[PDB]
Amino acid sequence: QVQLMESGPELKKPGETVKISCTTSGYTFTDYAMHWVKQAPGKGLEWMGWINTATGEPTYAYDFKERFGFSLETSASTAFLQISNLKIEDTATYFCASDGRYWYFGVWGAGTSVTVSSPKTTPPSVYPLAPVCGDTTGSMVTLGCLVKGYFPEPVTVTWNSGSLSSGVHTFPAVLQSDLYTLSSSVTVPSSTWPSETVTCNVAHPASSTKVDKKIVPR
Amino acid sequence: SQLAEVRSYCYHASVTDISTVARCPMTGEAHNEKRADSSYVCKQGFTDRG
């Protein structure tokens, strides 16, 4: 079976170098070129180029030239994407492909998310959020959990060990000083709080911090 | 009295901004982006490769 796996999420800093690996299976490696496609932070897919594999020849898209590279290893069927002088604007997801030439490809790579930032590994600030009188609308009391300033991704935010997923919305996090801030809100009826325990469980194995915070009434 | 300008001749020249785009064998023609401007003097060629 043809399945293209890549190096996983990579943590980088501006000014360094990286070689992004693409490991291929199900076919002879030198027989298919590797189409490299960058996904811009705005979710634009920007095509990096294809490497003639035989012959080991990279073909760059002009915008990607001279700070990027395509290198290969034939025996283990691993294609490599080399990047020099890392830049924060390069934070993105990268992809490889098994070449069907002028019709592109039938199989997409697993993807590689490069993160170029200059933070310190940090545990999140996990705050139980007490709803006020105006926060109780329509028989339900909405509760929330602020996850503030954690690096790196991901964080597992559950509620009462994940026992209640009903009204749980775990929102994405964006960059603040290269730190991530997200919030998660559980929606339970007003009869369940503060009658029943509601505790947001934030598991951040990257910083090795599992935080448990219960919301208390005011 | 009056003399029209027929043409001119540049006898003395100097080389500026040497640029050579290398490519692999069997790729046929090599194309440098400098062939757009007429100020750049471009020429084909080859490099024996190992």
- Determine the Cα–Cα distance for residues A57 and B25; give it in Å rounded to an integer: 10
Q: What phi and psi values does residue A190 have, to the nearest 5 degrees?
A: -65, -25
Distances in whole angstroms, Cα of residue A73 to Cα of each of A117, A169, B11, B17, B32: 29, 44, 53, 36, 29
Question: How many Å apart are CA A36 and CA A134, to the nearest integer?
Answer: 51
Question: What is the spatial distance between Cα A92 and Cα A164, in angstroms, rounded to a whole number?
Answer: 33
Closest-CA residue in chain B for A55? B24
Q: What would the DSSP string read from start to end of A149-202?
A: EEBSS--EEEETTTT--TT-EE---EEETTEEEEEEEEEEEGGGTTTS--EEEE
A102: which DSSP letter? G
Tell me the shortest Cα–Cα distance from A65 to chain B, in angstroms: 12
Interruption sites in chain B after residues (C→N beyond 2.5 Å): none
A55: number of Cβ within 10 Å = 13
For A138, half-sphere exposure in the C-beta direction (CA atoms, 13 angstrom radius) is 3
Interface test with A, best of B19, B23, B24, B32 (most A CBs within 10 A): B24
Exp. method: cryo-EM
**Backbone dihedral region for residue B22 (phi beyond 0: left; psi -120 to 50: alpha; all else: beta):** beta
**Per-residue DSSP letter, B44:** -
Beta bridge partners of A139: none
> How many whole angstroms from its chain centre is CA A81?
19
Which residue shows structure tokens 């490991």? A23
Long-range contacts of A161-169 (CB under 8 A, 24+ apart): A161/A201, A162/A201, A164/A188, A164/A198, A167/A140, A167/A142
Interface contact A57, partner B, CB < 8 A: yes
Q: Which of A50, A55, A62 to mutate: most B Cβ within 10 Å?
A: A55
Residue A113's closest CA among A168, A43, A65? Answer: A43
Could you tell me the resolution of this structure in angstroms?
Answer: 4.7
Q: Work out the minimum CA distance from B49 to partner chain A, whole angstroms.
A: 11
Q: Cβ of A161 under 8 Å from any chain B Cβ?
A: no
Chain A nearest-CA distance from B18, in A, is 17
| CB–CB contact A57 B33 (8 Å) | no
Inter-chain CB proximity B27 and A55 less than 8 Å: no
B27 touches chain A (CB under 8 A): yes
CB of A103 less than 8 A from some CB of B: no
Q: Is A24 helix (H, G, I), strand (E, B) or coil?
A: strand
| Distance (Å) from the alpha carbon of A52 to chain B's nearest alpha carbon | 10
Distance from CA of A49 to the nearest CA of B (A): 15
Nearest CA in chain B to A53: B24
Name every chain A residue with its beta carbon within 8 A of the beta carbon of B27. 57
Q: How far apart are the first and last CA of chain A?
A: 58
Q: Does B31 touch chain A (CB under 8 A)?
A: no
Q: Which tokens belong to A177? A: 């000083």
Distance CA A114, CA A117 (A): 10
